């Protein structure tokens, strides 16, 4: 905190100059009133009591209008210093010409008091410097007043005033510094919550289409916001009609990715996909996601259109030309077959993990197959689009080599801490005051006034017990009883707070007023003595800045003024006039002062709660955005992206599992409103699979994505070092265990399913693969490789209630103690005959 404490005053300078202006105002007003008083009635026998006040007054107004100075931002310190010194000289010179017996102690005394408080308040002197100047000024004033018990009494007055003053000063200063730290943290929170909001917005837009993303930017229904923190999991899914759908599988993509760098593949893939994105925005089409050797897009689903078919097919043409260029830009003689179909789709998002907005219908599968049945280069279109293709393109009935399809090619500092310290100082000072009030009587072996000793002991015990309250509140010993502490500090409310503080600050005055019934009024010495006493007493009330302004001010006011105006008739008469004058002006001072200070207090509280709210909000926001990021991507890849633009990672080993719900589509009836409730059931299932991921042991697995009836998982990725305590390839088992789990899970799901059973088949492979991500402002991480389509087209060929397993995986898993009954040999696209293994040991008869 070197130049930061500088910045503190940098924003404290305005309020500081404000306080300073008002201070100088009061000072000049005081000098003026003292001049006119010493002029009007008495002490007209000399002019050196008034002319000094006049020149000091004009010096003060010059200080005031001078504060507008510019070469001031550091010199104001010495300005305050020298101004105090002027006050010092003025008061002491006006003081010394005394000791004639007709001047009073209390006049110059009160003067010094005001000087000390004002300095303590505004002048900002370093603790050491402020303190030494205070004590020096006090000793000098009292020693000039010298020209046995009285002197030590006055010295005690000096020192207790110094105590209360240093208290006030340190409180003001710590308030300033803490409040500055608070506003700093709060603006920190503003300028970081903005960027958190922006980042999560980039996220949500890179997961959901602009329209529905901005819909989610309304935060109207807190149901989706309850997903951050119950029968049917909530979700928003709408049926939409007459949109276009386009798929594209990279022709022989596998053979293309034969020997890529596991990083160059990443670039070229993301390159061509950024090309496709460049297209879709122009062509007015919404890409959805990218399925390995394939990728797909929709036409005007959020925003219905009539030319949506045109948009989609022209996007297809653009893709054709782009793959053409890259085919002779990178010189990769690899094309892509493309298909399209129009109809209706139920669109929404399902699943709590890795979920991305997606679309489903029979039309989906229709376009999908029409693509994977469509020729390279020429788009495989449907009758459903031909009916309003409008023949503005190269209509070609593309008959397959085997439903009316066609082809186209173109056309510290705690508030409690505060209370404890201020109570401490209040009781200590009041104590030493009444101490002097006793030792005031030094000649008698035992002083007469007994009620003084009574209230002495009484208030002593009251304040010391409140002290014990505070000290066991802070040091936290809990020696008596925590129930007592709780029930006995519940009374420390907010308004009873006011009242108990009021009484605790009121008690010193009545305490010293134990000496009021006796005779003092004849003695002019005891008179000025008790005047000094009562003024020193009333000026104490300031110290509880945690207590109200109107309250404390009026209380001090009445408790000081009452008995003195009373004894103004009990007398040494004109001194009554002068003392009530000084008492009054002092009251106005302390009134305004405690006013402005309680202001400082309210301000600090306000700032504290405000910055606390902002901290809570940024906490929640970072929580939610982290949650979405972890939804879209894994963790170690989040590490990489923060340090790397892109990502790329090969894995020689890795297990991959596909779970495909066979009997879904047949279970799916469309005679309802598209039967979308069946999709609600599907979403329920997918959520009950997501919970399987958050299992601790199953935290080891990574859900890649989901494709309608498809659930896709894999592992061997978060694995960054083979541990001596873990067998290197045992994850394949725990991955396999996952299969054994969810296969079981659906039965429970089927157990809640009456007179029907869902049946899924699960295909597993293991081996090498690669992981990468698509792009920025559109985030998606995924995997590719031979094992990928191997296991995909594998589970494509499985059987429900049984586990189709690759043979090489079959070996290592048999070695992992697992049992398999041989299935046979199957035919894979590009892979010919492949030996397979079923896990369940003849689940059927045999």
């Amino acid at each position: 905190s070197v130049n930061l404490e500088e910045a503190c005053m940098e924003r404290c300078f305005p309020q500081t100059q404000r306080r300073f202006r008002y201070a100088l105002f009061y000072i000049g007003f005081a000098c003026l009133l003292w001049s006119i008083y010493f002029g009007v009635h008495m002490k007209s026998k000399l002019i050196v009591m008034v002319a000094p006040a006049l020149c000091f007054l004009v010096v003060c107004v010059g200080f005031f209008l001078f504060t507008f100075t510019k070469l001031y931002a550091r010199h104001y310190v010495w300005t305050s210093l020298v101004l105090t010194l002027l006050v010092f000289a003025l008061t002491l010179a006006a003081q010394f010409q005394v000791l004639t017996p007709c001047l009073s102690q209390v006049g110059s005394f009160s003067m010094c008091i005001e000087v000390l408080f004002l300095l303590y308040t505004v002048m900002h002197l370093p603790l050491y410097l402020s303190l030494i100047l205070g004590v020096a000024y006090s000793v000098l004033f009292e020693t000039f007043g010298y020209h046995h018990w009285e002197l030590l009494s006055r010295a005690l007055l000096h020192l207790c005033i110094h105590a209360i003053g240093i208290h006030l000063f340190i409180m003001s200063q710590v308030r300033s510094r803490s409040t500055f730290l608070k506003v700093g943290q709060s603006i920190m929170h503003g300028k970081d919550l903005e960027v958190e909001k922006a980042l999560k917005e980039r996220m949500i837009h890179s997961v959901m289409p602009r329209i529905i993303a901005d819909d989610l930017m309304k935060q109207g229904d807190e149901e989706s916001e309850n997903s951050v923190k119950i029968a049917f999991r909530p979700f928003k899914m709408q049926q939409i009609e007459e949109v276009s759908i386009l798929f594209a599988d990279i022709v022989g993509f596998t053979k293309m990715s034969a020997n890529k760098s596991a990083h160059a593949l990443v670039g070229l893939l993301n390159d061509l996909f950024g090309r496709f994105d460049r297209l879709c925005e122009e062509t007015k089409c919404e890409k959805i996601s990218t399925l390995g050797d394939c990728y797909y897009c929709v036409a005007g689903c959020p925003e219905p259109r009539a030319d949506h078919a045109y948009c989609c097919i022209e996007m297809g043409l653009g893709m054709i030309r782009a793959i053409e260029q890259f085919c002779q830009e990178k010189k990769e003689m690899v094309n892509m077959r493309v298909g399209v179909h129009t109809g209706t789709v139920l669109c929404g998002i399902l699943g709590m993990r890795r979920f991305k907005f997606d679309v489903w219908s029979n039309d989906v599968n229709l376009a999908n197959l029409m693509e994977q049945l469509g020729v390279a280069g020429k788009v495989h279109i449907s009758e459903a689009t031909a009916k309003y293709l409008d023949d503005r393109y190269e209509m070609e009935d593309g008959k397959v080599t085997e439903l009316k399809t066609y082809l186209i090619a173109g056309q510290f500092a705690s508030a409690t801490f505060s209370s404890l310290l201020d109570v401490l100082l209040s009781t200590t000072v009041f104590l030493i005051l009444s101490i002097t009030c006793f030792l005031r009587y030094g000649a008698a072996s035992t002083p007469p006034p007994p009620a003084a000793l009574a209230v002495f002991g009484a208030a002593l015990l009251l304040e010391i017990l409140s002290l014990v309250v505070s000290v066991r509140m802070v040091f936290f010993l809990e020696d008596v009883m925590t129930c007592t502490k709780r029930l006995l500090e519940w009374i420390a409310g907010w308004l009873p707070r006011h009242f108990i503080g009021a009484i605790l600050v009121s008690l010193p005055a009545l305490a010293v007023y134990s000496h009021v019934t006796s005779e003092f009024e004849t003695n002019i010495h005891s008179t000025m003595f008790t005047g000094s006493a009562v003024l020193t007493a009333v000026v104490q009330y300031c110290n509880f800045c945690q207590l109200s302004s109107w309250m404390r001010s009026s209380l001090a006011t009445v408790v000081g003024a009452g008995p003195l105006l009373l004894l103004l008739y009990v007398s040494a008469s004109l001194i009554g006039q002068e003392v009530i004058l000084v008492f009054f002006l002092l009251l106005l001072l302390v009134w305004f002062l405690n006013r402005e200070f309680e202001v400082s207090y309210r301000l600090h509280y306000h700032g504290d709660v405000e910055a606390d709210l902002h901290r809570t909000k940024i906490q929640s926001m970072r929580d939610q955005a982290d949650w979405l990021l972890r939804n879209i991507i894994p963790y170690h890849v989040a590490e990489q992206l923060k340090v790397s633009q892109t990502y790329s990672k090969n894995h020689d080993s890795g297990g991959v599992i596909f779970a495909s719900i066979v009997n879904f589509s047949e279970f799916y009836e469309e005679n309802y409103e598209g039967g979308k409730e069946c999709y609600r059931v599907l979403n329920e299932l997918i959520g009950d699979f997501d919970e399987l991921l958050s299992k601790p042991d199953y935290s080891s697995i990574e859900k890649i994505k989901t494709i309608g009836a498809t659930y896709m998982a894999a592992s061997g990725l978060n694995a960054t070092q083979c541990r001596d305590g873990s067998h290197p390839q045992e994850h394949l088992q725990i991955l396999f265990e996952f299969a054994k789990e969810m296969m079981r899970v659906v039965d429970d799901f089927n157990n809640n399913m009456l007179w029907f059973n869902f049946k899924l088949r699960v295909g597993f492979n293991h081996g090498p693969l690669t992981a990468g991500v698509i792009g920025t402002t559109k985030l998606l991480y995924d995997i590719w490789g031979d094992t990928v389509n191997i296991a995909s087209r594998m589970d494509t060929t499985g059987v429900e209630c049984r586990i189709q397993v690759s043979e090489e995986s079959y070996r290592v898993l048999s070695k992992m103690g697992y049992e398999f009954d041989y299935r046979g040999t199957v035919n894979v696209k590009g892979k010919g005959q492949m030996k397979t293994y079923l896990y369940p040991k003849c689940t059927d008869s045999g």
Partner: protein
């Protein structure tokens, strides 16, 4: 935005999901509700239902441990006549067919077949229309609303119906009860208001059309057990009914079928003291209906955990007054439950 109010008028609605096996009365009861709070082929299908029933008796005539012989075998051609039209997709229903149906309907071999109706799948309103249609043997008659409610239509798929009861919105869903349809009911399980599971009370001595080997009542019991435990159903109370009170009472009065024969738990069974029977009600019938009542209550007793409750009542669907009164009571219950959320 016109949506800030619509969602609340949805919140101001009652979703009434109907369950129950086929031929339970779900179609019947939703027909009843429409009448109580709200284009000619209706008259046709009735005859078809007739055409069904007239077959069911004669078909099952040879399908009993005795081959059911006519008291008048000379009308066997009549039988054959029906067996001639035993499967006619369309049918003009010629008057000679009406005569052939009636003549055998008065036959007492046909009577002995019909009286053993339990031993084969058969509609419920059979004997009723077997006399009501003699009134509409001609063609210029519009059947009664009583026939309308007794019209046997097979429920297949979500049949939504809306209406209003004194400024309260109600939206019921008729849904079939046959085994395959039970794959559908799940679709309606989303935040429905009240779940009316009706059971054909008189279907304790008969088996379902699925396998003809599982007791209709025992079947529905297992069904209700399953659903009372459904992971999405542990949170909404269930309103239960017992349709065809009258037919069950006739079963008792006939004293031919024995509940203890079908379910011995009734022999050693005691009438509960909280029974509130109607005047002139056979105490044995009161015993039996509450026997079944608890038999279902038992399932709603072994679980629920105070999160979803049963409220078993009684119902005869052809008695619109029964429906009205019990439904008013149910309206009270459901308007209570509506805000339970």
């Amino acid at each position: 935005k016109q949506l800030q109010k619509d969602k609340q008028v949805y919140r101001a609605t009652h979703r009434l999901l109907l369950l129950g096996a086929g031929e339970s009365g779900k179609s019947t009861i939703v027909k009843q509700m429409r009448i109580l709070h709200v284009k000619a082929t209706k008259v046709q299908d009735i005859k078809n239902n007739l055409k069904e029933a007239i077959e069911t008796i004669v078909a099952a005539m040879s399908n009993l441990v005795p081959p059911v012989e006519l008291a008048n075998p000379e009308n066997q051609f009549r039988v054959d006549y029906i067996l001639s039209v035993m499967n006619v997709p369309d049918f003009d229903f010629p008057p000679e067919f009406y005569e052939h149906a009636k003549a055998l309907w008065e036959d007492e071999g046909v009577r002995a077949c019909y009286e053993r109706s339990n031993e084969y799948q058969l509609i419920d309103c059979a004997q009723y229309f077997l006399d009501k249609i003699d009134v509409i043997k001609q063609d210029d008659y519009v059947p009664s609303d009583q026939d309308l409610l007794r019209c046997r239509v097979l429920t297949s798929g979500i049949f939504e119906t809306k209406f209003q009861v004194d400024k309260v919105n109600f939206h019921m869903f008729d849904v079939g009860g046959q085994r395959d349809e039970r794959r559908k009911w799940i679709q309606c399980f989303n935040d429905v208001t009240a779940i009316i599971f009706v059971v054909a009370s008189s279907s304790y001595n008969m088996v379902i059309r699925e396998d003809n080997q599982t007791n209709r009542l025992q079947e529905a019991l297992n069904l209700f057990k399953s659903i009372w435990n459904n992971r999405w159903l542990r949170t909404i109370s269930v309103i239960l009914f017992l349709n065809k009170q009258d037919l069950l009472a006739e079963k008792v009065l006939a004293g031919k079928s024995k509940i203890e024969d079908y379910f011995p738990e009734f022999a050693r069974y005691t009438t509960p003291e909280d029974a509130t029977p109607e005047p002139g009600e056979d105490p044995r019938v009161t015993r039996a209906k509450y026997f079944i009542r608890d038999e279902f209550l038992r399932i709603s007793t072994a679980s629920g955990d105070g999160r979803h409750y049963c409220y078993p009542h009684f119902t005869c669907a052809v008695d619109t007054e029964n429906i009205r009164r019990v439904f008013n009571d149910c309206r009270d219950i459901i308007q209570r439950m509506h805000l339970r959320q």
